[PDB]
Amino acid sequence: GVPGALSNQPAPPNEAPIATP
Amino acid sequence: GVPGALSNQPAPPNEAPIATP
Amino acid sequence: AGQLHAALDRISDRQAAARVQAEKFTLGEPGIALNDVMADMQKASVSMQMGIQVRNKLVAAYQEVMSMQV
Amino acid sequence: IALNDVMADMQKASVSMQMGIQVRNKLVAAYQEVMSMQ
Amino acid sequence: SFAGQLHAALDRISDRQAAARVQAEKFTLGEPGIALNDVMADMQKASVSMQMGIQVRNKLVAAYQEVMSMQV
Amino acid sequence: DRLDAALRFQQEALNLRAQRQEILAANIANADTPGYQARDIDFASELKKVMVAVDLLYRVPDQPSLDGNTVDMDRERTQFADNSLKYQMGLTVLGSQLKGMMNVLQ
Amino acid sequence: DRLDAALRFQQEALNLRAQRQEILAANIANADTPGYQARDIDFASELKKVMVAVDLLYRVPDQPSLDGNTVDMDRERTQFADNSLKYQMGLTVLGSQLKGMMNVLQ
Amino acid sequence: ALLNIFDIAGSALAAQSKRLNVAASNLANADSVTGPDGQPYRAKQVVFQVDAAATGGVKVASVIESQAPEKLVYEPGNPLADANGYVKMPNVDVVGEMVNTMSASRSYQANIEVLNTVKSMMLKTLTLGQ
Amino acid sequence: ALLNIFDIAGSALAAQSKRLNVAASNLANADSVTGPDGQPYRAKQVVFQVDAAATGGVKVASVIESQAPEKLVYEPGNPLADANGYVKMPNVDVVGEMVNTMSASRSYQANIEVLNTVKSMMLKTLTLG
Amino acid sequence: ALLNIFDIAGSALAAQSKRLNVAASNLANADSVTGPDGQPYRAKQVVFQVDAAATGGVKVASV
Numbered sequence A, B: 001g002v003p004g005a006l007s008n009q010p011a012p013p014n015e016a017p018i019a020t021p
Numbered sequence C: 001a002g003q004l005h006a007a008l009d010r011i012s013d014r015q016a017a018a019r020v021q022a023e024k025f026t027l028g029e030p031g032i033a034l035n036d037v038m039a040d041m042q043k044a045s046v047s048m049q050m051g052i053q054v055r056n057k058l059v060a061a062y063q064e065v066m067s068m069q070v
Numbered sequence D: 001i002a003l004n005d006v007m008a009d010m011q012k013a014s015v016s017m018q019m020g021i022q023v024r025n026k027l028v029a030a031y032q033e034v035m036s037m038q
Numbered sequence E: 001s002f003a004g005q006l007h008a009a010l011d012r013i014s015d016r017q018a019a020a021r022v023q024a025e026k027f028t029l030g031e032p033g034i035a036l037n038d039v040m041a042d043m044q045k046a047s048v049s050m051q052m053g054i055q056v057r058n059k060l061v062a063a064y065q066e067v068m069s070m071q072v
Numbered sequence F, G: 001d002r003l004d005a006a007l008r009f010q011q012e013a014l015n016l017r018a019q020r021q022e023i024l025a026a027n028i029a030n031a032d033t034p035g036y037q038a039r040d041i042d043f044a045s046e047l048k049k050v051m052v053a054v055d056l057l058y059r060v061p062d063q064p065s066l067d068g069n070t071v072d073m074d075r076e077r078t079q080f081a082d083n084s085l086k087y088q089m090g091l092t093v094l095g096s097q098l099k100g101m102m103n104v105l106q
Numbered sequence H: 001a002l003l004n005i006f007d008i009a010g011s012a013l014a015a016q017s018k019r020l021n022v023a024a025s026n027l028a029n030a031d032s033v034t035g036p037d038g039q040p041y042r043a044k045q046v047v048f049q050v051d052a053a054a055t056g057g058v059k060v061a062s063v064i065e066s067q068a069p070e071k072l073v074y075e076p077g078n079p080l081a082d083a084n085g086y087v088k089m090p091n092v093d094v095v096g097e098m099v100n101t102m103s104a105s106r107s108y109q110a111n112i113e114v115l116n117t118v119k120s121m122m123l124k125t126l127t128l129g130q
Numbered sequence I: 001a002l003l004n005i006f007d008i009a010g011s012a013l014a015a016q017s018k019r020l021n022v023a024a025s026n027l028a029n030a031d032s033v034t035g036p037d038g039q040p041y042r043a044k045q046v047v048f049q050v051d052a053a054a055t056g057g058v059k060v061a062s063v064i065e066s067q068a069p070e071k072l073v074y075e076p077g078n079p080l081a082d083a084n085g086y087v088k089m090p091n092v093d094v095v096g097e098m099v100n101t102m103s104a105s106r107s108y109q110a111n112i113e114v115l116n117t118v119k120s121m122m123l124k125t126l127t128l129g
Numbered sequence J: 001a002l003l004n005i006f007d008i009a010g011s012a013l014a015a016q017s018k019r020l021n022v023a024a025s026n027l028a029n030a031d032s033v034t035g036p037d038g039q040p041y042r043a044k045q046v047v048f049q050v051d052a053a054a055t056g057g058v059k060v061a062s063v
Helices: C003-026 C036-066 D003-036 E003-028 E036-068 F002-029 F043-051 F073-103 G002-029 G043-051 G074-104 H004-028 H094-129 I004-028 I094-126 J004-028
Strands: G057-059 H044-050 H058-065 H071-074 H086-089 I044-050 I058-065 I071-074 I086-089 J047-051 J057-062
Touching: C003 C036, C003 F002, C003 F073, C036 D003, C036 F073, C036 H094, C036 I004, C036 I094, D003 I094, E003 E036, E003 G002, E003 G074, E036 F002, E036 F073, E036 G074, F002 F043, F002 F073, F002 J004, F002 J057, F073 H004, F073 H094, G002 G043, G002 G074, G074 J004, H004 H044, H004 H058, H004 H094, H004 I004, H094 I004, H094 I094, I004 I044, I004 I058, I004 I094, J004 J047, J004 J057
Parallel strands: none
Antiparallel strands: H044 H058, H071 H086, I044 I058, I071 I086, J047 J057
């Protein structure tokens, strides 16, 4: 939820697609 | 081994050849 | 002569309350401003010092009164 | 009440107790000596 | 049961001191898992226990001398 | 016994503060490694459970990064300062309590 | 002699800490001498041998250097700080033990 | 609690960092075009709000796209050109972004100074607990 | 009894802590706008009163919004713009807030020093004998 | 559990120093036509790793 809080699961990995698939 | 650890025998001499024979 | 018992119970309750407040603050929930806890700790320490001084004075008096020679 | 006041009261009580105990011990020692002597 | 209780008290005091000593010895040799604050707190507790023991000893011996120095 | 029970809570708070300090140091030292997730522990729940290894959980990311790292320097620094100050306070409380317990023997 | 050994463990720990501090100071002072080899000792094994005439080992280099100097700076500075802290810890432990032994005789 | 000062300062620092990052991203995308899926790039801003716990810290609810009209540049040679042969260039105010960066830096420094002073005060506070 | 100094100094420390907190919040939200439910943020100040129960310590009666004029910025390109395209900005003086912070810190340190001195004197009274 | 802080911080310092050395080497040899053997110079960079024996300090795997 609010950034900086505690979560039990990792966030999904980040990606920066140059062009949409 | 890992840098900063301890080992029995000293490091070999370091050389910077200008051109490989 | 239970007044000393009442006084020691009261000072023990005071210092126990100070300890409880310190524990509540260390629990990480906002109810304490880090000043009330320290002031209560100092007051509890002073009261305990007064109590132990009273104990020493009273036991010295008892020793003297027992040291009589009829 | 005041801390200095209670300390002074304790001192007064101690001094009075010492005075009374010393007077009583001196008197009883004198009486015992009188009884022992013929 | 008096001497047994006294020996049990001495046993507990000596065991606490030995535990503090072995914990400090384990820490100073580099074994992981031992905390400096933990070992300091344990040593302080052992010292407090020893001080309580010596106070009790002094009180008991003073009482013994007072009660056996009188004349019957 | 009684002596250990009088100090168990403060000692455990000190130990948990030290462990959280180590976690913060690790996840501020790994500030450049991609794919590394920020770590921390729930101090209140951990302390209550231990007074009744160590459980740790990931931190909610603040802003996305292409490499994958999810550590925020200012947040880590504030948490570090808070934990350091609370550790110092716990040490002071323990020292005062031990000093009083020693003083009661005279 | 029982007192001798009981304090001897910590006394030897302190002595080895002092020796390691001296070696660290030496390789700090000679940090810019070309053709120098970093030297250090293994505290745990050395203490074990002494308890049951000191040999020193060459520190593993981390980066090459043309002038033949292998003594790093950051690693040995952290080692210096750690050794100083542990020397102080040993000193205060020995002092506490000695004072506890002394006050019993009062 | 005398400890919510750290929370307030940390929230202020995080908000200022977010605003600076948004400004830097806009400056980087000043003259970009045809982002992913072909939609023209649009600038974004942030909105600060206070956390009424009275007095509280600052937060950023969400990033809001600018409603200022995009620049329409005549260039039929680009496949993005509409029936009028126009391409949509993003609206970036360079002076506005420079001013925003300056303000963010100044606020960040002020907050770090406040944190320094309060940390000194709090360190000095504990000396009376003995 | 010399013991009421602890209460007086504790009240003073609480008041100074609250003043510092308010000043820090104002500094943090100096640039903030559009607070919750749309009302713009307003600078807040505290009020110090004497907790007479003759003379005594200082308590905080309440917190009051400052009545300084509220700043306006001309930005029609914003949903918060009014009929004239003005966004409301809080009336916060950074120099005033920083001076308040420094003065509060100094007063807090002075009061804790007073507390330590009184503690030492009372311990001396305890060890009079 | 407080003496590992020195190890973690020292590892971080060493890794950052290695990264700085690599960057300096790249900047110095930005315009090196050839090396000793004859092959053209190629830019180098480090690869960090998590030095967990669980999290700990950072560690440089290789270049």
